[PDB]
């Protein structure tokens, strides 16, 4: 917990149902990024919890938590990362000279931030694009912690069993969306049609441009039974090695 | 959710 006064909220950065997004300053030397809750949306004590374990988790692929402020609103102080969510980044300027290699390196970092979470027993429960940050140099972390109906997992979805493994299959859900460079997933389909449609067996299918291998990986994170999803740690090694084990024979294209 |  800090001093309220000592920070600084200059710029919006953006605004959620429970609360907003501002970068700001910390005793005036320190530049961070400033989450609000909105009051009414989460009791205070209760939120007072979850957020211990935010303190608890140190990686250098998760957004890192600075400080907090107790009282309502309340504010949870961050490291700022210039280039804002993944999804924005896509959709932006850059999605257009992001090739294969560059997604494919984000991906890494993603599962490695991942893998972590996997080993310290925790669960994200929200894992898009939208909850990707992106940094300097191609730097992604993964943020905001625990509806997205299309990154969610069918026994999530249905009977709310929120595993690593949940994660994994919202994970290659992930992975289409930076060979799509930001699409959304289930392109054509409403959350009921595609809710419908996975417990069919339906899974999308091969993203122009993107090879069969990634692909494959994509479909392992998304088999009806969790315990056969990969680990993180499986994909975080399997995406760092892609362009020497799996694709070196790999040629640039129009977009990946 | 907090800002996308």
Not at chain 1, 52 to 68: D, I, N, P, S
Not at chain 1, 88 to 109: H, I, N, S, T, W
Not at chain 1, 177 to 200: A, I
Not at chain 1, 234 to 251: M, N
Request: glycine share 6%.
């Amino acid at each position: 917990e800090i001093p309220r006064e000592s920070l600084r909220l200059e710029v919006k950065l953006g605004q959620g149902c429970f609360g907003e997004v501002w970068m700001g300053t910390w005793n005036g030397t320190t530049r961070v990024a400033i989450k609000t809750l909105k009051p009414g949306t989460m009791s205070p004590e209760a939120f007072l919890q979850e957020a211990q374990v935010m303190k608890k988790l140190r990686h250098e692929k998760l957004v890192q938590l600075y400080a907090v402020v107790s009282e309502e609103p309340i504010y949870i102080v961050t490291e700022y990362m210039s280039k804002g969510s993944l999804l924005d980044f896509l959709k932006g300027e850059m999605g257009k000279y992001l090739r294969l290699p560059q997604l494919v390196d984000m991906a890494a970092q993603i599962a490695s931030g991942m893998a972590y979470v996997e080993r310290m027993n925790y669960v994200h429960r929200d894992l898009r694009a939208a909850n990707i940050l992106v940094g300097e140099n191609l730097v992604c972390k993964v943020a905001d912690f625990g509806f997205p109906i299309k990154w969610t997992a069918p026994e999530a979805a249905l009977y709310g069993r929120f595993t690593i493994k949940s994660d994994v299959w919202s994970f290659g859900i992930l992975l289409t969306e930076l060979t799509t460079k930001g699409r959304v997933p289930y392109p054509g389909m409403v959350n009921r049609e595609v809710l419908d449609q996975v417990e069919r067996g339906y899974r999308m299918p091969c993203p122009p441009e993107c090879p069969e291998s990634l692909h494959d990986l994509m479909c392992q994170c998304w088999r009806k039974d969790p315990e056969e999803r990969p680990t993180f740690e499986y994909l975080q090694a399997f995406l760092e090695d892609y362009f020497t084990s799996t694709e070196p024979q790999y040629q640039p294209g129009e977009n990946l | 959710x907090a800002x996308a």
